[PDB]
């Protein structure tokens, strides 16, 4: 799981509002939401940041996006939504465990930050 | 015509020019014509998928390949302080071209919320 708060969430050591879980990822609502619906999809494998993901991680990263879009449909986001991965300081990455943001329920604007 | 006839299908088939960063059998990376950051490029599959909400379960590897190519191109472009990847879905997501595309933006501090 890793040495971050997201590792604690994976290990069920602190609570989170879990939306979906399987053997390789976990989706849960963001504790500081930026849209009426704002959740995260994270791998259970501790990849600290997208910049260090290996080629063998391709299917896992794609799995996060497929889970993300299936959860978005399940949460009723039929008008659309935005998916975000942050990397590093300029990207605004807040936890050094790879995570996919999914935001919806309001108009998302341009530029995306 | 393989890839469809959105602007991105035309770019895939070299019918409309673009500033290409990387190309392989599965995807194409090229700079955005209206950049929202000092570096702003797109990674698209060559397979036509209109939007992420209709991607199939067996598109997992392809979607992940977009992100791996995105981060490898970011490194090759010297985005050593980081970057943001964005996929827009539908009207609320701000989608304007219905051929799946991953944005990669960097070269400045990105703000929160992401739009």
UniProtKB/Swiss-Prot annotation, chain B:
Complex formation: Homodimer. Interacts with CDK7. Interacts with RUVBL1 and RUVBL2 and is associated with the LEF1/TCF1-CTNNB1 complex and with a KAT5 histone acetyltransferase complex. Identified in a complex with MITF and CTNNB1. Interacts with CDC34 and RBX1, and is part of a SCF (SKP2-CUL1-F-box protein) E3 ubiquitin-protein ligase complex. Interacts with SUMO1, SUMO2 and RGS17. Interacts with the Ten-1 ICD form of TENM1. Interacts with CALM1; interaction increases in the presence of calcium ions.
Q: What is its EC number?
A: 3.9.1.-, 3.4.22.-
**InterPro entries from the UniProt entry:** Histidine_triad_CS (IPR019808), Histidine_triad_HIT (IPR001310), HIT-like (IPR011146), HIT-like_sf (IPR036265)
Q: Which disease is it linked to?
A: Neuromyotonia and axonal neuropathy, autosomal recessive: An autosomal recessive neurologic disorder characterized by onset in the first or second decade of a peripheral axonal neuropathy predominantly affecting motor more than sensory nerves. The axonal neuropathy is reminiscent of Charcot-Marie-Tooth disease type 2 and distal hereditary motor neuropathy. Individuals with NMAN also have delayed muscle relaxation and action myotonia associated with neuromyotonic discharges on needle EMG resulting from hyperexcitability of the peripheral nerves.
Q: Could you tell me which residues carry Phosphoserine?
A: 34, 61
A GO CC annotation recorded here is: nucleoplasm
Q: Provide this UniProt record's keywords sorted from A to Z.
A: Acetylation, Apoptosis, Cytoplasm, Disease variant, Hydrolase, Neuropathy, Nucleotide-binding, Nucleus, Phosphoprotein, Protease, Thiol protease, Transcription, Transcription regulation, Ubl conjugation pathway
Q: What is the effect of changing residue 40 to R?
A: In NMAN; no mutant protein is detected due to post-translational degradation; no effect on SUMO-specific isopeptidase activity
GO molecular function terms noted in the UniProt entry: adenosine 5'-monophosphoramidase activity; deSUMOylase activity; hydrolase activity; nucleotide binding; protein kinase C binding
Protein name per the record: Adenosine 5'-monophosphoramidase HINT1
Q: What is the effect of changing residue 86 to M?
A: Loss of SUMO-specific isopeptidase activity
Task: State the superkingdom.
Answer: Eukaryota
Effect listed in the UniProt record for changing residue 33 to F: Approximately 10-fold increased affinity for tryptamine adenosine phosphoramidate
Organism whose genome encodes this protein: Homo sapiens (Human)
State the Gene Ontology BP annotations.
Answer: intrinsic apoptotic signaling pathway by p53 class mediator; positive regulation of calcium-mediated signaling; protein desumoylation; proteolysis; purine ribonucleotide catabolic process; regulation of DNA-templated transcription; signal transduction
**Biological role:** Exhibits adenosine 5'-monophosphoramidase activity, hydrolyzing purine nucleotide phosphoramidates with a single phosphate group such as adenosine 5'monophosphoramidate (AMP-NH2) to yield AMP and NH2. Hydrolyzes adenosine 5'monophosphomorpholidate (AMP-morpholidate) and guanosine 5'monophosphomorpholidate (GMP-morpholidate). Hydrolyzes lysyl-AMP (AMP-N-epsilon-(N-alpha-acetyl lysine methyl ester)) generated by lysine tRNA ligase, as well as Met-AMP, His-AMP and Asp-AMP, lysyl-GMP (GMP-N-epsilon-(N-alpha-acetyl lysine methyl ester)) and AMP-N-alanine methyl ester.
